[PDB]
């Protein structure tokens, strides 16, 4: 059993050390549940993101390999093009042998030079991989590395130290009650079905059920555009001149909870959840995002969700646990 430390970067990104190659060469990556791919900067990339982030040197380790399998990823927000490579990898204490992982040669745009971490490491299935890359997660259950095919993420709260990802175990002191299973809708994100929104026993929103994501890579609870305006108007969140749903910090106080309605299961959060505070300036945790898919419309159930709910992502199972934060 593995477990990785993440810092937590303003309650809006969280990421841990890796090393790659021999010897180590140290890299932050983001721990992403909603993307499948290993990559990091390179020194062949001269993009200014990669000038202000540390740098894979294939020609300082022994064990590195290359391929020539190019890769490309465009994300949410941010993009890369860059080249496959194997090398060992440690991550949460564990030397993962014979993992491919891109190597970056493009970083278009300005998202990634302001960001504290290097790369993105993925938690997402095989089928959600560029180029097919095999995923970490996917290597060490291949490699005998865990012996049971799961992790779990527990995310802290107001910047706190603590935050952490287990692989190949749950961890029962983060959390209170039993894990409520949930079954992985398609596998490809950790998606599953949203049965409603509610607010004082209303519904708000995915009347009929929906289609959302664990993605402990996206900062704010996501959803379209038109459904989150309605929640933001709910709570009374308005956006100022400068592109930001401002709320008054009184209201953390006054307004009720949002519920979460999942395989059947309440799973609310409180204003103190929903709402982001720094010292008198409080914004919405919801953010409207459209991401159209077969299915429909995906809602990202991101880190304002996941710090509340210990989170295991189970792929022997195909399921995700979920359980109150203890
Ligand atoms: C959703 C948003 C608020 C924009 N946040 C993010 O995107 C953060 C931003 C972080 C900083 C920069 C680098 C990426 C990290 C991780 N991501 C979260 C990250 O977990 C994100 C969640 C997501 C899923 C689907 C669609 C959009 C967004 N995943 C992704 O972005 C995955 C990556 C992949 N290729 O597998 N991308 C896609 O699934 C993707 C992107 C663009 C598309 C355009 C057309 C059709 C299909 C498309 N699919």
Redesign the pocket.
Same mark, same amino acid.
């Given at each position: 059993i593995g477990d990785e430390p993440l810092e937590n970067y303003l309650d809006t990104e969280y990421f841990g050390t890796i090393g790659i190659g021999t010897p180590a060469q140290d890299f932050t990556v983001?721990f992403?549940?909603?993307?499948?791919?290993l990559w990091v900067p390179s020194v062949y990339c001269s993009s200014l993101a990669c000038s202000d982030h540390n740098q894979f040197n294939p020609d300082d380790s022994s064990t590195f390999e290359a391929t020539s399998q190019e890769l490309s990823?465009?994300? !949410?927000? !941010?993009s890369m093009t860059g080249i496959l490579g194997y090398d060992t990898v440690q991550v949460g204490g564990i030397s993962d042998t014979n993992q491919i992982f891109g190597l970056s040669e493009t970083e278009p745009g300005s998202?990634?030079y302001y960001?504290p971490f290097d790369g993105?490491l !993925?938690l997402?299935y095989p089928s959600?991989?560029?180029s097919g890359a095999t995923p970490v997660f996917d290597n060490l259950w291949d490699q005998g590395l865990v012996s049971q095919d799961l992790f779990s993420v527990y995310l802290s709260s107001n910047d706190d130290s603590g935050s952490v990802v287990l692989l190949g175990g749950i961890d029962s002191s983060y959390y209170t009650g039993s894990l409520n299973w949930v079954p992985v809708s398609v596998e490809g994100?950790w998606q599953i079905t949203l049965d409603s929104i509610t607010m004082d026993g209303e519904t708000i929103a995915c009347s009929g059920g929906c289609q959302a994501?664990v993605?402990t890579?996206?900062?704010?609870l996501?959803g379209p555009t038109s459904a989150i305006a309605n929640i933001q108007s709910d709570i009374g969140a308005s956006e100022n001149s400068d592109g930001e749903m401002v709320i008054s910090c009184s209201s953390i106080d006054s307004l009720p909870d949002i519920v979460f309605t999942i395989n059947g299961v309440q799973y609310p959060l409180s204003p103190s959840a929903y709402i982001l505070q720094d010292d008198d300036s409080c914004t919405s945790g919801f953010?409207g995002?459209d991401?159209?898919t077969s299915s429909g419309e995906?809602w990202?159930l991101?880190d304002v969700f996941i710090r509340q709910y210990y989170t295991v992502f189970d792929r022997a199972n195909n399921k995700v646990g979920l359980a109150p934060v203890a």
């Open positions: 983001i992403d549940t909603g993307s499948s791919n990823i465009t994300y !949410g927000t !941010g998202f990634l960001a993105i !993925g997402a959600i991989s560029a994100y994501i993605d890579g996206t900062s704010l996501t953010e995002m991401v159209p995906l990202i991101g």
